[PDB]
Symmetry: D2
Subunit: 210 residues, 4 copies
C-alpha cells in the first residue's frame, strides 16, 4: 500500500547496473503489491534543465501569488516534479557515482524540487533564518553503482564519497530522514558479481517488508 516515485539517473539503459538493480526492487515490490502505483521519472537518459536566474526570481518571489504567467511558466516543470514527490510515499533513486558525485541530471532534479514555501520554509529568529522541512511521511531508497571500491562506510575512500552522503543531506533538508542506501562496487573491474548479488538479496528483502 505504498505509492512509489522511481527516479532513474543513469544515462545508460539496459547496461545500467543502478537502473537494473532498482527495477529488481520495483518488480519485487510489484509482486507483493499488485495494486501499488509506481511512477517513473527519467533524469538520466533525458535532459533536465539547470536552474536559471528566471527560476531563482520566481521561486524566491516575496509575494508568490503575484508571479506573472511567464514566472509561473518558469516554475511549471518544478511544480510537476514536486507534485510527483508529494503524491508518493516511497522515493527510489537509482544513480551511478560520476566523478565522486552524482550525474548532473540528478543534481538538476534536486535543484528543481527544493522549493521555498513548498518543500522547505524558514523564519528569522533574531535575524537568523531558521529552516523547516515541509515533506513528512516520506521514505527514500538510494540504489547506487560504482566503478571503484571502498566508498562505503569504513572504506578506504569513504572521504571521497560525495554522492549518496550528499543525497542524504539534501533529502533530509526537505524532510526525508528515513533513507536507505544499497550499493554495488567494482563495476569497472567486473567479485562485482558478488557485490551485485548481495545488492539484489538486500533489495528483495526490503521489497518484501516495505
Amino acid at each position: 500500500m505504498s505509492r512509489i516515485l522511481a527516479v532513474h539517473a543513469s544515462p545508460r539503459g539496459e547496461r545500467s547496473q543502478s537502473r537494473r538493480l532498482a527495477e529488481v526492487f520495483l518488480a519485487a515490490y510489484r509482486e507483493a503489491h499488485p495494486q501499488a502505483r509506481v511512477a517513473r521519472r527519467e533524469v538520466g537518459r533525458v535532459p533536465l534543465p539547470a536552474v536559471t536566474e528566471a527560476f531563482v526570481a520566481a521561486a524566491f518571489h516575496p509575494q508568490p501569488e503575484q508571479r506573472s504567467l511567464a514566472m509561473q511558466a518558469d516554475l511549471a516543470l518544478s511544480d510537476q516534479l514536486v507534485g510527483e514527490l508529494f503524491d508518493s510515499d516511497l522515493l527510489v533513486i537509482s544513480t551511478p557515482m560520476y566523478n565522486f558525485s552524482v550525474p548532473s541530471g540528478l543534481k538538476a532534479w534536486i535543484d528543481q524540487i527544493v522549493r521555498l514555501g513548498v518543500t522547505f520554509d524558514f523564519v528569522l529568529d533574531n535575524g537568523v533564518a531558521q529552516y523547516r522541512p515541509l515533506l513528512r511521511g516520506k521514505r527514500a531508497l538510494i540504489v547506487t553503482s560504482r566503478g571503484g571500491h571502498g566508498f562505503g562506510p569504513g572504506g578506504e575512500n569513504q572521504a571521497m564519497n560525495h554522492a549518496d552522503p550528499w543525497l542524504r543531506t539534501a533529502l533530509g533538508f526537505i524532510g526525508i530522514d528515513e533513507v536507505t542506501v544499497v550499493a554495488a562496487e567494482g563495476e569497472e573491474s567486473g567479485s562485482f558479481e558478488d557485490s551485485c548479488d548481495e545488492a539484489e538479496q538486500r533489495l528483495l528483502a526490503l521489497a518484501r517488508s516495505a
Copy 2:
C-alpha cells in the same frame, strides 16, 4: 600566467561569486598586464550532461579507432579539456546550491575528467601538472567552512577539491562568502591580496 575562468552562477550582475571572481581577475590583470584570461561560462548557458554515447566514446578501448560520430560526441569535451591544458591558474566561481554546486558545474567536471587525457589507469594517476586553482564561492547560510557547525554538510568546494585532485590539481585555495541570504568585504580584500602575488 594564463588563466581559465569558469563561472557557475546562472546570475549575471546579481551574482556574488561572479562579481568577486571578477574583482580578483581585474586585480590580477593590473599586476600582470600580459596575462591572458579565457572565460568558460557554465552557469548562464547550458552544458550538456554525459550521455551513453559519451561513455562509449570516452572509454573506448582503442581511441585511435573512434569513428567520426564518436569523435563528435567528444568534441565539446576536447575543447573544454584543451582550455584547461592551455592554462596555469584555474579560477572557478560558484554558488552553493543545495549543499553542492549548480548542475552546470557538475556537468563541466563530467566533461573534463577523461581517461587517457586528464587521468590514466595502470591504480589511477593524474595527468595534469603545474596547475593551481582558486575557488570562489558564495553561500546563503553560515558555518559551512573549516571548523563550522555545518562543515559536514558542505559538498560543494570539498567535492571540487576531490575531483580536481583526481586529475592532478592539488594546489587549491578556497575563498568563501557566507550569509548572502541573511564577509564579502573580507573575501574581497582576501582576493585582492591574493591577486598581488600570483
Copy 3:
C-alpha cells in the same frame, strides 16, 4: 465549452508580443467561458529536448508493446505532450518569426508530437507508404509576431515565410486542418501599434465566437 492547449514559443516574457496577444485571446475566451479549461505548455522560456536517435528507435519500433522500460522513458515527455493535445479541443500557438521560421523550441515540440501510430499512421499500397492523420475534431489558432513587413498573403516577402505556412503543413499532417493565423508585423520598426490593435480586435472577435 472548449478545452484549450496554449503553447507559448517566445523566449521573452512580458516583452513578448506574440505571448501578449495570445493571452489577450485566452483572457477574452475566459470571460465568455468561466468554466473552460486552459492548459499552458511553455516551449520558449524553457528548453525542449531535440529528437535523439534513442527517440527514433522507440517511436518507430515495429512492435511497440515490446519497448523496454528505458525505451519508454525515451518517449515519456512525448506521451505527455501528445496527451495534452488529445485532451484539448483548441490549440493556440504563439510564436515569433525567427530567421524566417519558428524558434527551435517550437520545432522541437512539433518533433515530439508527430508520433507513428499516435498522431499519424500509414499503410503500404503497392509498396508505397500512405499516410493518415489520427487527430480529429481539433482546431488551431496561430498567433505570430514579426519584426519586418510583407510576410503575409500578398506581401512582398511572402515567399520567405517558412514559419506559419510550415506550421499549417505540419499540423495538417496530423489532422488539424482548421487553422487560423493572426499576425502582427513591423515589431522591429515600432504603425506597429496599428498592426497590434488590428490583431487584438481580430482575436477578441474569435474568442467571442469560439
Copy 4:
C-alpha cells in the same frame, strides 16, 4: 578550400545524410590533399535555443559596452560565427523532419545570424561573401524536390536557402536522397562528381 561541415542528424552510422556528406568530404580531400575540414555537430549534441539574454546581447544598441555577462551569453555564438568566417565551403547534412529540419539545425542558424556580424541594417545587407554551400539532405518520402507533387510542403532546404541567402551565402547546391522510409546511388555519384571539381 577550407570546409566547415555541419551535421544535423541525431543518428550516427545509421544516418544517410551524414554518410553521404562524409562520402563527399572524403572525395574532396583526395582531390585537394591540403584541405582543412572543421566539423560542427548539431544533431548528436544539443545546441542551446536563443534565450531572452541572447536577444538582449545580440541586439545591444552599443555592442562595445556589452558587459562580461552579456558577452558570455554570446560566446557560443561568436565561436559558431567564427567557424563560418574561417571557411570557404559550408557543407550541411540534414534529414527532413516534419517538413523542415531537426530543431538542432534551426538552433544553429539562430546562433549565426547576428546583427553587425553576418548582416547589417541601413534595409538589410548580407555581410558574408565569397562563400558557397552544399546542402545534403535525406528524406523518408518522395516528391519534395523541384517539380515534385509535394514541393510546396518542403520547408527544409528551401528555408535553408532563404536563411543562408540573408547573410550572403547565395551559391547553394542541394543534393537530395528520397525514399528512405520506403536515388542514394545517384546522389552519391552526384556528390563524387561535385567533389572532383570544387
